[PDB]
Design a protein around this ligand. Structure first.
Ligand SMILES: O=C(O)[C@H]1O[C@H](OP(=O)(O)OP(=O)(O)OC[C@H]2O[C@@H](n3ccc(=O)[nH]c3=O)[C@H](O)[C@@H]2O)[C@H](O)[C@@H](O)[C@@H]1O
Ligand SMILES: O=C(O)[C@H]1O[C@H](OP(=O)(O)OP(=O)(O)OC[C@H]2O[C@@H](n3ccc(=O)[nH]c3=O)[C@H](O)[C@@H]2O)[C@H](O)[C@@H](O)[C@@H]1O
Ligand SMILES: O=C(O)[C@H]1O[C@H](OP(=O)(O)OP(=O)(O)OC[C@H]2O[C@@H](n3ccc(=O)[nH]c3=O)[C@H](O)[C@@H]2O)[C@H](O)[C@@H](O)[C@@H]1O
Ligand SMILES: O=C(O)[C@H]1O[C@H](OP(=O)(O)OP(=O)(O)OC[C@H]2O[C@@H](n3ccc(=O)[nH]c3=O)[C@H](O)[C@@H]2O)[C@H](O)[C@@H](O)[C@@H]1O
Lengths: 389, 389
């Protein structure tokens, strides 16, 4: 009986699409013909174990298309999951793909209930509901991690829908019904609350990582053992032994990332906290780059530009800011990134062969330790302590 | 067979003193004759349920004195628990009571092993061990909360001793032996690590509170419901539903408290994080005071100057910064603080009678909600949401 349309087929879109398609008609809409074509062949266009396997082994009422009229037709719900983020040039939060999908749906099927899953600024929903004069827009935050997308939906921490209504609960049941986890905590709120819940949840996660990275910098510069200190600190149950693995800096979260983005949007965000994670991150990259330059390297080898294993994001990857700082000093950099087709990145040679890379670099820096590097461990610089995230 | 001396009898000192006195000879040394006199009469000089009751109902090998020669004589361990904190005038971290007790013990019983429990700056132990030429000084952080002092020792999150040695484990066993909780996680480290573990654990707790207070400010200024937002944010298990009750600002932790203390000690502490909690706290008090002044009050009534129920600390209490801000505007303030003998505080009248206070104040502000105020709830301003800490 029920038809759900996903507008945008990135990992957030497919995650929800596949979850719901176990019991309902799901139609995935995208603007890239080629991704759509593979989806229709049951081939996942992104790396994510469960998405790839549910799409090829489980019976799903799922299909993809680049046709919005066929996609939105008779849709009961349209989940919006198109790209949103702060623009790196203008520094304004860019919500144009979402604006666009809303005008389209309003135009093509003003009876569908639109659930926004893409992160948006606090107050976006209330404002657009008013600027266009519609009422069928509801925000519902996404809390999943790239690479565990479907997984986090099959076992969600919780579900938050930005509307207190029957249609809002109807949607929550769709999500609970597809999930493996039972008794998912479910909270119904207004849309501005729900947007703020997303903003603050991410702010905190970024804050936690920023904090462990200062702690780690502090230990390193003071000659202390990071791991014993973190163990000691995390034995306090109010702090916890989780999400505490030092790195070269954090990236992502749809949070202003430098002080220019913070300034262009202060007042949409909690000013002191953001200022804090932004300054800590900038500071962490200076410390890390300084720490690498002190080993007086001749050629630095950057091992992987993606941040998390199996990722497809370079944008938000802190190793970039390290390269930037080392190159500022004139040190040559070579890169080992299989996912990268380009032969040079900001003019640094991208070496295709792992062994040639290992031989040419006197210092190899890597955000997380890796098996492939075990044989050159003696020249590997990483602040990874636990091997997770 | 074993004798332990506690130098300093505040709640940290008595906590440990009573814990250990269940199975060993404990002698408490203080410089205030009157406190000592009451201890010898089995009367606790501080409010703390378990300390008062263990001291008066359990068989303890415990006594107090103002005589250092008798106190330190034949002591195997001397636990140092004298006052340390940033001085509010010079802004330097003041460790003089601890310096003093160490010269004394070195002088009187250079064979006792000194365990510092008072919070000290990172590197203090290593440095003093060297400046004096002694070796019997070990730092071991205290993680207890005023009012639950003995309680937190009977059920500690963990035990950290700043030394890897037999004498260090001997001490850890004293602590484990007195405890009710079993299998206490125990970590042995060097002293600088152990000092940093204390610094960072407190930094994080202050950070968490600072964060929930921005979140709360953000909601209030945006018209949102704080409680739903916090519920939503805390349903993420990486964040947790604990230690998240909004207040007028945090106080304490032996952390630099304003930017002058931060500046006088930057480089002993994690610069960006501290700068962040300090700015957030200053900002929270501006927001709260502004929020109270907007109710255009004629007389503001400050209900309790202590921060936590049953506390004896005014120093670190954020309601002070609120008074300061409201008085800056010329609004009269009256105070209801039974623990305070003074008839005026910074020239604001301290009203002794709760009913007269209730009648004279058009706005009553209070850090946590209280039963006594239920009948005037309509004019009570508090940001307390959960009724805890
Ligand atoms: O809105 C989002 O974008 C998502 O952001 C993160 O998901 P994700 O960035 O894919 O994975 P994380 O593990 O949270 O990594 C976040 C950042 O912190 C860093 N990090 C994370 C964990 C850690 O222990 N150490 C560490 O340095 C990562 O390398 C990365 O820079 C959150 O975990 C999700 O809940 C949220 O929905
Ligand atoms: O130079 C930049 O591109 C950016 O640097 C900062 O943004 P931020 O995120 O704080 O930069 P970092 O994390 O410190 O470094 C990442 C950036 O370095 C650049 N990059 C990367 C690799 C490289 O070899 N050289 C290089 O300049 C990339 O554009 C990447 O965005 C500034 O705040 C931005 O104004 C500026 O756009
Ligand atoms: O070294 C110390 O001094 C101690 O500091 C705190 O103990 P305490 O300050 O007595 O009690 P807390 O409950 O942690 O209160 C800390 C501050 O945060 C505020 N707070 C705390 C918790 C909360 O949910 N909301 C909140 O505003 C309190 O009013 C106060 O300003 C820590 O909890 C102890 O582990 C630590 O040993
Ligand atoms: O005016 C001050 O005494 C202090 O204010 C700040 O220190 P901070 O902790 O950031 O001050 P707040 O928390 O904003 O306010 C607390 C202070 O206000 C003062 N106070 C209290 C009550 C009152 O009615 N008037 C008043 O001035 C007390 O001295 C108390 O220390 C400044 O950073 C310090 O330089 C200065 O010593």
């Amino acid at each position: 009986f029920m038809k759900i349309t996903i507008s945008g087929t990135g990992y957030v879109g497919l995650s929800n699409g596949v979850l719901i398609a176990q019991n309902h008609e799901v139609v995935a809409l995208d603007i890239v013909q080629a991704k759509v074509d593979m989806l229709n062949q049951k081939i996942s266009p992104i790396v994510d174990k469960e998405i790839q396997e549910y799409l090829a082994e489980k019976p799903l009422n799922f299909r993809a298309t680049t046709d919005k009229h066929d996609a939105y037709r008779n849709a009961d719900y349209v989940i919006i999951a198109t790209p949103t983020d702060y623009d790196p040039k203008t520094n304004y939060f860019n919500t144009s793909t979402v604006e666009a999908v809303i005008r389209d749906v309003t135009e093509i099927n003003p009876n569908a209930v639109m659930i926004i899953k893409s992160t948006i600024p606090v107050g976006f929903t209330r404002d657009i509901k008013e600027r266009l004069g519609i009422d069928n827009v509801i925000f519902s935050p996404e809390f999943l991690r790239e690479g565990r997308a479907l997984y986090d939906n099959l076992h969600p921490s919780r579900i938050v829908i930005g509307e207190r209504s029957a249609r809002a609960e109807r949607f929550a049941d769709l999500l609970k019904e597809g999930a493996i986890k039972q008794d998912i905590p479910t909270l119904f709120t207004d849309s501005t609350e729900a947007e703020a819940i997303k903003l603050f949840a991410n702010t905190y996660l970024a804050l936690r990582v920023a904090y462990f990275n200062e702690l780690d910098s502090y230990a390193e510069s003071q000659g202390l053992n990071s791991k014993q200190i973190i163990e000691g600190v995390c034995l306090d149950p109010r702090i916890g032994n989780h999400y505490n693995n030092p790195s070269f800096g954090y990236g992502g979260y749809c949070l202003p990332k430098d002080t220019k983005q913070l300034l262009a949007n202060y007042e949409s965000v909690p000013n002191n906290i953001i200022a804090a994670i932004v300054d800590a991150n900038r500071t962490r990259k200076d410390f890390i780059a300084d720490s690498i330059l002190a080993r007086k390297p001749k050629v630095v080898g950057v091992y992987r530009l993606i941040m998390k294993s199996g990722s497809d994001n370079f944008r938000a990857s802190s190793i970039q800011g390290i390269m930037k700082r080392i190159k500022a000093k004139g040190i040559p950099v070579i890169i080992y990134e299989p996912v990268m087709q380009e032969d040079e990145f900001f003019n640094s040679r991208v070496v295709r062969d792992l062994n040639a890379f290992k031989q040419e670099a006197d210092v190899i820096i890597s955000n997380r330790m890796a098996e492939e590097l075990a044989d050159v461990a003696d020249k590997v610089y990483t602040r990874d302590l636990f091997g997770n995230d």
